[PDB]
Design a protein around this ligand. Structure first.
Ligand code: BMF
Ligand code: NA
Ligand code: NA
Length: 115
């Protein structure tokens, strides 16, 4: 039968890793791959108090710090919203974030997550 971790389907570790891998590959610019560095954008954290990125999300999935698949999706939603709050409509970064907002739930679904 199922392991205790398998049988608790609130969080599905491997499905969540698939999801992050899909986002990683969708990210042509690599803009969401790693945390925003204050050295690169020193006015960013005045705006964004809850930064998050795909590497940090993957780490949390691996370490088992997410309670549910939806919590993983919440961090992706916030990642995207952060970009649309900080950036100026029309910029390369804004355009990529818009594309992510329209696509991420479909990728979560394809990857086997509860949506
Ligand atoms: C001030 C002009 O706007 C930007 O340079 N924006 C962004 C640039 C980068 C890069 C590193 N990442 N990034 C992320 C994530 N979210 N926004 C940005
Ligand atoms: Na089994
Ligand atoms: Na599980």
């Amino acid at each position: 039968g199922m392991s205790k971790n398998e049988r608790d389907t609130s969080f599905n570790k491997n499905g969540c890793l698939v999801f992050v891998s899909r986002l990683w590959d969708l990210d042509k610019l690599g803009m969401f791959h790693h945390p925003v560095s204050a050295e690169e954008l020193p006015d960013y954290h005045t705006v964004i108090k809850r930064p998050v990125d795909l590497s940090s999300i993957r780490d949390g999935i691996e370490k088992g710090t997410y309670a549910t698949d939806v919590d993983v999706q919440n961090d992706v939603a916030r990642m995207i919203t952060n970009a649309l709050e900080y950036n100026a409509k029309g910029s390369t970064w804004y355009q990529e974030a818009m594309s992510f907002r329209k696509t991420y739930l479909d990728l979560a679904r394809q990857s086997g997550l509860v949506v």
